[PDB]
Amino acid sequence: YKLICYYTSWSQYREGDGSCFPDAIDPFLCTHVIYSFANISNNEIDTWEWNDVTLYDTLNTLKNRNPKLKTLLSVGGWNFGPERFSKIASKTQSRRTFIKSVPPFLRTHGFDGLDLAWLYPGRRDKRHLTALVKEMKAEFAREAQAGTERLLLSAAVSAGKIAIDRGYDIAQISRHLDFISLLTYDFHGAWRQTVGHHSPLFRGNSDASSRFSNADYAVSYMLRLGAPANKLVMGIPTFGRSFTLASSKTDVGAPISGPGIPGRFTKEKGILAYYEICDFLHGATTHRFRDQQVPYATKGNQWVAYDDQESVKNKARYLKNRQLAGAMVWALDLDDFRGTFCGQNLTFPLTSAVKDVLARV
Numbered sequence: 001y002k003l004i005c006y007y008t009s010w011s012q013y014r015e016g017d018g019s020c021f022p023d024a025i026d027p028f029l030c031t032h033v034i035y036s037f038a039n040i041s042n043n044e045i046d047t048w049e050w051n052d053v054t055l056y057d058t059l060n061t062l063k064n065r066n067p068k069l070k071t072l073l074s075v076g077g078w079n080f081g082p083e084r085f086s087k088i089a090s091k092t093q094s095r096r097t098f099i100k101s102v103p104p105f106l107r108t109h110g111f112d113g114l115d116l117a118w119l120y121p122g123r124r125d126k127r128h129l130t131a132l133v134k135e136m137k138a139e140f141a142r143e144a145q146a147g148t149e150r151l152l153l154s155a156a157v158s159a160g161k162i163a164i165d166r167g168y169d170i171a172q173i174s175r176h177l178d179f180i181s182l183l184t185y186d187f188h189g190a191w192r193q194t195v196g197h198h199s200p201l202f203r204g205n206s207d208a209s210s211r212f213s214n215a216d217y218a219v220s221y222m223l224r225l226g227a228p229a230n231k232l233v234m235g236i237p238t239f240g241r242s243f244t245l246a247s248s249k250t251d252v253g254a255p256i257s258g259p260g261i262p263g264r265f266t267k268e269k270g271i272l273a274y275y276e277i278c279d280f281l282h283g284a285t286t287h288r289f290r291d292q293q294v295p296y297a298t299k300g301n302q303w304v305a306y307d308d309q310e311s312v313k314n315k316a317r318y319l320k321n322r323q324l325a326g327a328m329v330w331a332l333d334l335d336d337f338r339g340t341f342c343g344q345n346l347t348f349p350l351t352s353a354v355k356d357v358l359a360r361v
């Protein structure tokens with residue numbers, strides 16, 4: 001079983017206990033740690049935060065304590081215009097330039113693979129994504145000829161049917177990628193006003209339309225399209241989405257005037273780290289959708305949909321019953337890495353959970 005874990009570059013700038021460096025990672029915790037978001041300059045992979053070279057090294061040293069640990073560098077991301085990706089992938093000329101540039105950069109900095117986070121390709125991009133993947137993987141194999149371990153190639157994929165149908169050639173890329181991470185937590189629409197859970201596990205025997213929005217269908221659908229079950233990886237959020245209620249209505253479908261207030265350390269609207277969410281719970285009424293098997297809290301005019309040890313454990317089990325490769329946890333910096341916020345003196349509670357289940361069989 002695989003437990004891919006993401007670490008983001010910008011989680012170093014948070015204040016106080018919110019500050020997180022590669023340093024803070026249990027090297028034995030995960031099996032794959034993805035440093036989050038390299039970049040592209042002059043059609044070539046490049047750094048992002050000034051000290052990346054340093055964090056790179058801090059993170060890559062963990063392998064000194066656990067030799068079987070593997071690390072990957074991810075390209076793209078949210079703050080990386082998808083148009084930019086699209087532009088690099090259409091001109092075979094600029095695409096090659098990029099590909100050929102990766103191995104060295106990786107080899108140089110100690111990574112064991114690259115991770116494509118081209119965040120949502122267009123209907124006009126499917127054809128080139130495939131190209132990018134097919135060619136990149138090719139470059140990688142050729143490089144292995146040099147007598148060294150072959151680099152890993154993976155990709156962060158959307159779990160939205162339409163999204164998937166629009167720009168992904170699953171049956172294709174499935175054969176070139178080492179593993180596919182399903183973004184199974186961006187389900188609730190950032191477009192419409194209404195309380196809703198972003199990472200439901202199940203369809204929810206109560207709401208007709210949009211049965212395509214839940215982990216269960218995502219996985220099932222991917223499998224239909226051809227993705228081998230042994231290459232799939234279910235994404236598990238370690239954060240929660242906050243909403244500013246617009247009425248005393250707290251139950252399903254209640255009004256929403258906007259994104260909840262920021263977090264003391266997270267400082268961003270609609271997003272809360274698990275550890276922040278831990279503090280929040282105090283004096284908050286905890287609810288849990290039986291049908292979707294996920295929890296949400298409400299305090300004052302604040303409504304929060306999130307995941308806990310038990311919601312997370314479920315998915316972990318699901319993940320295993322369909323026999324998938326393993327799990328993907330978004331941001332170890334969002335989990336209680338210090339472990340001093342959520343009661344129990346445990347560090348990385350949520351991730352542990354996912355691990356514990358994956359390890360008892």
Ligand SMILES: *[C@@H]1O[C@H](CO)[C@@H](O[C@@H]2O[C@H](CO)[C@@H](O)[C@H](O)[C@H]2NC(C)=O)[C@H](O)[C@H]1NC(C)=O
Nearest residue numbers: 038039040041042043046047048049050081084
């Ligand atoms: C990552 O690389 C991109 C692309 O080169 C950088 O983007 C540009 O930066 C310059 C100067 O700020 C602008 O004139 C260009 O219009 C930008 N191009 C693109 C594609 O955005 C970006 O600055 C780099 N990131 C960091 C953190 O250095």
